[PDB]
Write an enzyme that holds these catalytic residues in place. Structure first.
Site, PDB file in Angstrom:
ATOM      1  N   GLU A 124       8.951 -42.560 -21.030  1.00 41.44           N
ATOM      2  CA  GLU A 124       9.278 -41.554 -20.007  1.00 41.44           C
ATOM      3  C   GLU A 124      10.254 -42.043 -18.991  1.00 41.44           C
ATOM      4  OE1 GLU A 124       8.413 -38.569 -19.968  1.00 41.44           O
ATOM      5  OE2 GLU A 124       6.704 -38.598 -21.309  1.00 41.44           O
ATOM      6  N   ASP A 172      13.589 -32.442 -17.127  1.00 42.54           N
ATOM      7  CA  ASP A 172      13.292 -33.149 -18.334  1.00 42.54           C
ATOM      8  C   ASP A 172      14.113 -32.549 -19.540  1.00 42.54           C
ATOM      9  OD1 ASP A 172      12.044 -30.851 -19.104  1.00 42.54           O
ATOM     10  OD2 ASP A 172      10.122 -31.800 -19.390  1.00 42.54           O
TER      11      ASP A 172
END
Ligand SMILES: [Cl-]
Ligand SMILES: [Cl-]
Length: 162
Positions: A11, A20
């Site tokens: 991540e 994202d």
């Protein structure tokens, strides 16, 4: 290696609100703020979670704090899920880590759609499960990560992360 290092690799870490891959506002280590398109909304959600006026920026400690909470919630979500719990309980630790990474990324809802794969997992049919998991939007959208997680599920080792 553990789940925390693993997810930190997958991540990354950003101290400023960012979008994202699906284009949702996020911050920290994969902490999704909101799926809505308002940045304000996002900032609001951010301030709510941190307990202060962040103005869209957090510190590293704050990010890690959200991260602990998020890992914890994901584990708990699995355990509370009637279909997942038994799969999870059937596996060794490395493979458990792999399942937590999936739930962390895609939520119980998304993971929820890997039934077939989870059946094969429960039966210890690794190769097949791996092949079944690749047949998914998940793998097509985020192939490098998917691959890492699939190998980990398949092998039960951390080789993909070394
Ligand atoms: Cl939160
Ligand atoms: Cl990826």
């Amino acid at each position: 290696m553990n789940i925390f290092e693993m997810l930190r690799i997958d991540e990354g870490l950003r101290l400023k609100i960012y979008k994202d891959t699906e284009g949702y506002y996020t911050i920290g280590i994969g902490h999704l703020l909101t799926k809505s398109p308002s940045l304000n909304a996002a900032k609001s959600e951010l301030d709510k979670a941190i307990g202060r006026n962040t103005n869209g920026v957090i510190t590293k400690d704050e990010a890690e704090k959200l991260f602990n909470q998020d890992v914890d919630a994901a584990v708990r979500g699995i355990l509370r899920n009637a279909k997942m719990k038994p799969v999870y309980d059937s596996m060794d630790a490395v493979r458990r880590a792999a399942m937590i990474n999936m739930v962390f990324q895609m939520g119980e809802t998304g993971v929820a759609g890997f039934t077939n794969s989870m059946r094969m997992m429960q039966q210890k049919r690794w190769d097949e499960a791996a092949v079944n998991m690749a047949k998914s939007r998940w793998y097509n959208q985020t192939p490098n990560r998917a691959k890492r997680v699939i190998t980990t599920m398949r092998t039960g080792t951390w080789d993909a992360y070394k």
